[PDB]
């Protein structure tokens, strides 16, 4: 499912703001820009997707993590396709390490779903309606994707392992495997299954994540053709 002209969309970036541990995944710096060995990206995807597929057909969740503005929506898109949890907005410390406690906050969201499902007394004061609404709206912003996650994930998918340092550290502290799209400014050794490629351009994120989902959806029953994306 992997394709070959990802060259058409990314082959890496960033001038010498690199992490030396990312050396083995670099071809050269042509424009004064670290360019990624796309053959390495291929070979890695082969190893990585193999892990993904196996995890899919054994029926276990993958928590997709993206928070940078460019990968914001694109992860809500494709993770929804998989029907798998994501965190798009703020990564709340202890989402894994303090799971049960954060999960105490979906119940609130849950209980606000029901209460506002009407009426169960709209005879609650004026000032309260506005409040609890603002609450639900609020809760909705952050726990929208995390609410699907009803128990500790089997692995996580990160768009930027550097940006998402905390998440990488939480999962790792829990022996939960970590798969990641990572460019030259990330730390390879911290990542279990690497996608050495640009993590900034939405194009690359789109290619890698959508095609990642195509692995997920295909392996747990049926398949499907193209998924929503901005040019």
Partner RNA sequence: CGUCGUCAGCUCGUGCCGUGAGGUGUUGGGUUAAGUCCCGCAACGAGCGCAACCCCCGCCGUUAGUUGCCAGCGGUUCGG
Q: Which is nearer to RNA, 33 or 106 (CB)?
A: 106
91 binding RNA? (CB under 7 A) = yes
Question: What residue has token string 């940006």?
Answer: 163
In the complex, the smallest distance separating the C-beta of residue 53 from RNA, rounded to whole angstroms, is: 30
Q: Is 136 in the site for RNA (CB under 7 A)?
A: no
Residue 134 binds which entry of RNA, Mg ion, none, CB below 5-8 Å type-dependent: RNA
93 binds, among RNA, Mg ion, none (CB under 5 to 8 A by kind): RNA
Tell me: does residue 97 bind RNA (CB under 7 A): yes
Contact between 166 and RNA per CB under 7 A: yes
Is 94 among the residues that bind RNA (CB under 7 A)?
A: yes
Cross-strand pairs, 155 = 62
Helix spans in the chain (H): 38-56, 72-81, 99-115, 126-143, 165-173, 202-219
136-150 core/surface letters (b: 16 or more CB in 10 A; e: else): beebeebbbbbbbbe
Query: Cβ of residue 178: shortest distance to RNA, in angstroms?
Result: 15
- Minimum CB distance to RNA smaller for 149 or for 212: 149
Environment class of 58 (CB within 10 Å of its CB; exposed 0-12, middle 13-18, buried 19+): exposed
Other beta carbons within 10 Å of 186: 27
Smallest distance from the beta carbon of 134 to RNA, in angstroms? 6
Per-position DSSP letters for 44-94, written without gaps between them: HHHHHHHHHHHHHTTT--EEEE--STTTHHHHHHHHHHTT--EE-S---TT
In this chain, which of 55, 62, 77, 102 binds RNA, going by CB under 7 A? 102
Residues that bind RNA (CB under 7 A): 90-94, 97-98, 100-102, 104-105, 134, 138, 166, 169-170, 173
Residues interacting with Mg ion, by CB under 5 A?
A: 199
């Amino acid at each position: 499912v992997k394709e070959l002209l990802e060259a058409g969309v990314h082959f890496g970036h960033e001038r010498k703001r690199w992490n030396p541990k990312f050396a083995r995944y670099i071809y050269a710096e042509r424009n004064g820009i670290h360019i990624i060995d796309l053959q390495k990206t291929m070979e890695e995807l082969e190893r990585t997707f193999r892990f993904i597929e196996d995890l899919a057909m054994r029926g276990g969740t993958i928590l997709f993590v993206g928070t940078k503005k460019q990968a914001q929506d694109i992860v809500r898109m494709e993770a929804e396709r998989a029907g798998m949890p994501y965190v798009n907005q703020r990564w709340l410390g202890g989402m894994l390490t303090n799971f049960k406690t954060i999960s105490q906050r979906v119940h609130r969201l849950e209980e606000l779903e029901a209460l506002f499902a009407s009426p169960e007394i709209e005879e609650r004061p004026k000032k309260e309606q506005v409040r609890l609404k603002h609450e639900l709206e609020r809760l909705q912003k952050y726990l929208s994707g995390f609410r699907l996650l009803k128990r500790l994930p089997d692995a996580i998918f990160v768009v930027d392992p550097t940006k998402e340092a905390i998440a990488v550290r939480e999962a790792r502290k829990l022996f939960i495997p970590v798969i990641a799209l990572a460019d030259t400014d990330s730390d390879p050794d911290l990542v279990d299954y690497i996608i050495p490629g640009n993590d900034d351009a939405i194009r690359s994120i789109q290619l890698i994540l959508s095609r990642a989902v195509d692995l997920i959806i295909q392996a747990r029953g049926g398949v499907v053709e193209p998924s929503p994306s901005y040019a």
